Design a protein around this ligand. Structure first.
Ligand SMILES: Nc1ncnc2c1ncn2[C@@H]1O[C@H](COP(=O)(O)OP(=O)(O)O)[C@@H](O)[C@H]1O
Ligand SMILES: Nc1ncnc2c1ncn2[C@@H]1O[C@H](COP(=O)(O)OP(=O)(O)O)[C@@H](O)[C@H]1O
Ligand code: NA
Ligand code: NA
Lengths: 312, 312
């Protein structure tokens, strides 16, 4: 009954909005509310995929603390399988405090030593791999210790067991290059790069050229997210552009990529053709940019399906 | 077995240091650590009084959330009785985010709707008052709903059971004046105002003057904390100054007042005379200003007693 296993760091965000740009001008900021929220690509994806109707399991490692507890409770409420989401007293669950000014300005205070940086291949339980159909690596480069060699092993274990392999990416944190992951990429079935970051990573400027760098490493299908323009897909010699949902005015696109990937994976598991998977992903992502927060918009599934009847 | 009942708001803190004065512009601050800490006058006192060898119970109300559970974990660990520390599903446990600059500056982002603001007389269980000897109101004015009328009621209940009533203070949050709590003050045996804040509240400049406004309301003993100068004590005409522990460098005075009151209360329960109660309070407070954090310095009684020999 398990369709997806998502691997990545589960973390907690604490948004502080809105604060003055000259924060120390005053002594205190009595906000309307201060509360934790689950964040991180892995959490967002497992959460959205689950709401879309596909049973998911999250593999990660958090601390034995209040933030870790909040994550587990979130997963229990979303019906995310948490058997492989272990707690460790030796670490602190990463907590990202995001400050925002009553004008738009943003900044983030993070824990350079949080659980996000501690995640490694040891937190991956291969025995469970035969229980799901698809593996989603919620962000290559996100957790540095999960480098090329680790991913190659993770993906190698996934491929025995015949799983479909999906992966998103973020900008490298430790100067890594495409070189560092080219071998790991040869095992990937669907890669979901972000245009700007993919451009910076490959050093190429056009969608075709950027996509070719990944395909040359062995990736089967490349799905580049182009924000307002939807997405660009390339497999073998075939390319296809799929326009974003029309008319939408984005509040904020935080987590838009995660929602996109989730919608795509859902369509994939349901056997839709490549264009249909792209439209479902664009529709899911579109709904999420209309609300503040990564997982606010996509509350269920009906919402996405309704937007689909109105894609134009 | 139960020696003290402390009443106040139990909260959690997330200290962020060090951040830029010009916090925005950057996008990131990878700190060495971001972790929760229990905080609040009531929690700090219950904690230190417990480490000093006296059993304490904390009366409060927090949210039935992750933060709340964290406070309950801290209490159990410190052997603080949490029978009267209720969890409420409808409220969010207050979380204070503290920002500190590399060179001094401090600001706090708070939750104007937090549990701290919700505390009221209904959260006080008068039935247990017969189980303890001393009542400690961890800060008049801290929780607005506990105004002069409520305190009068609480203190009347405490006095009918012959408890010793101690009270600490903070600066009024909603423009309350000394007249708003003068009737309540007539039930207090020991009041611990901070010098600067007492000056603002009473409108006086002299310790003798300040102490006098409180004595006028019926307070038995006034113990004004004067930082590096130790403390000033005054009773019906009788006045006394007690020098602080000399030679104390002083790293930070966060929670120094809570430590002072805890040491004073411990000495009172041990039957010490007024002067040595002050010495013990000054000694406990001294140890706390040497370490960063409110309850970091005073880990055990022996640490204070050692410092006590050579108080000079
Ligand atoms: N303004 C928008 N209108 C419609 N869909 C959008 C919009 N912005 C983002 N999306 C959806 O989110 C997906 C991911 O967006 P992303 O590439 O990260 O955009 P950005 O760089 O603007 O943050 C897109 O492929 C699209 O489906
Ligand atoms: N520099 C110091 N040296 C010795 N004891 C100190 C010092 N600073 C504070 N204390 C202790 O803490 C108690 C309360 O401190 P308080 O007056 O509130 O300090 P502050 O004004 O720095 O907040 C004092 O009465 C004293 O016992
Ligand atoms: Na995005
Ligand atoms: Na103090």
């Amino acid at each position: 009954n398990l369709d997806v296993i998502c691997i990545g760091a589960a973390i907690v965000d604490i948004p502080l909005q809105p604060v003055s740009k000259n924060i120390f001008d005053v002594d205190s900021y009595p906000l309307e509310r201060i509360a934790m929220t689950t964040g991180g690509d892995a959490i967002n994806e497992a959460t959205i995929i689950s709401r879309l109707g596909h049973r998911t399991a999250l593999m990660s490692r958090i601390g034995k603390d209040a933030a870790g507890q909040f994550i587990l409770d979130h997963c229990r409420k979303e019906n995310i399988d948490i058997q492989s989401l272990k707690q460790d007293v030796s670490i602190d669950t990463s907590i990202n405090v995001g400050l925002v000014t009553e004008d738009g300005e943003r900044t983030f205070v993070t824990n350079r030593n949080g659980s996000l940086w501690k995640l490694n291949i040891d937190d991956v339980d291969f025995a469970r791999f035969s229980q799901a159909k698809l593996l989603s690596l919620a962000s290559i480069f996100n957790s540095p210790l999960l480098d090329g060699k680790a991913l190659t092993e993770i993906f190698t274990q996934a491929k025995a067991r015949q799983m479909i392999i999906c992966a998103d990416m973020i900008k490298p944190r430790l100067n890594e290059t495409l070189d560092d992951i080219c071998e790991a990429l040869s095992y990937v079935d669907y890669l979901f790069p972000n245009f700007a970051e993919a451009k910076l990573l490959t050093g190429k400027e056009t969608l075709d050229e950027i996509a070719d760098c990944f395909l040359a490493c062995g990736v089967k299908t490349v799905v580049i997210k182009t924000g307002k323009d939807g997405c660009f897909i390339k497999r073998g010699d075939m390319t296809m552009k799929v326009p974003a949902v029309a008319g939408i005015t984005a509040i904020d696109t935080i987590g838009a990529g995660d929602n996109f990937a989730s919608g795509f994976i859902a369509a994939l598991l349901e056997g839709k053709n490549l264009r249909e998977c792209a439209r479902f992903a664009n529709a899911t992502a579109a709904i999420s940019v209309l609300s503040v927060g990564a997982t606010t918009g996509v509350k269920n599934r009906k919402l996405v399906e309704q937007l689909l009847e109105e894609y134009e």
